[model samples]
Target: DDIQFQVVVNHEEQYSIWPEYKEIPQGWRAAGKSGLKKDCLAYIEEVWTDMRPLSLRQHMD
Candidate 1:
């Protein structure tokens, strides 16, 4: 079933999606875009392209 959802990011910049009905969990921040589940998934994929943890990439750079 398609439900309302929003893209969220964690301290590692890892992405997740949750329904708009619940409070955003601790250690997670909204990516500021909200809509259908598929829409949120698209947004997450757009932003989280690297797919690596933040600090790991920092050290490699």
Candidate 2:
């Protein structure tokens, strides 16, 4: 199946990929970006280098 990718964020602002055909789950919002799954994954790799969630990053500091 040809799957499209949508960039999504939870309350923590953590990034993840979602299928374009599906509605985003409650409590998550689109990051206003979408593209091929691989491209989205690559984008996340470059931008989301910090694996820690926002709260965790703040608390760990």
Candidate 3:
């Protein structure tokens, strides 16, 4: 099944939670300085079209 979806590569933040978190409790603070940004199922596409997936190309239709 060929499925496509969007991946959040970068964040377009409007607010600075860091400064506000300085006055809040530990649990209320952001998880970490870095986030899980820049990812995509495009890797699979690259594999199928560019030869780099975890598996070989099985679709030969």
Model 3, 1-61: lDDT tens digits are 1222232221211112233213433334332332222223333233334332223333432
Go through the candidates in order and give each one's C-alpha lDDT. 0.87, 0.87, 0.29
Clashing pairs for predicted structure model 3, backbone only: none
RMSD of each: 1.1, 1.5, 15.7
Which residue pairs in candidate 1 have backbone atoms (N, alpha carbon, C) closer than 3 angstroms, thus clashing? none
1-61 per-residue lDDT for model 1 (tens digits): 3678888889988989989899999999888889998888888888888987998899888
| TM-score of each model, paired residue for residue | 0.90, 0.82, 0.17
lDDT of 1 at 5: 88
Q: Report the number of clashing residue pairs per model.
A: 0, 0, 0
- Cα-based RMSD of candidate 3: 15.7
Cα-lDDT of candidate 3: 0.29
Shift of residue 46 alpha carbon in model 1, Å: 1.3
Q: Where does candidate 3 have its weakest 10-residue lDDT segment?
A: 8-17
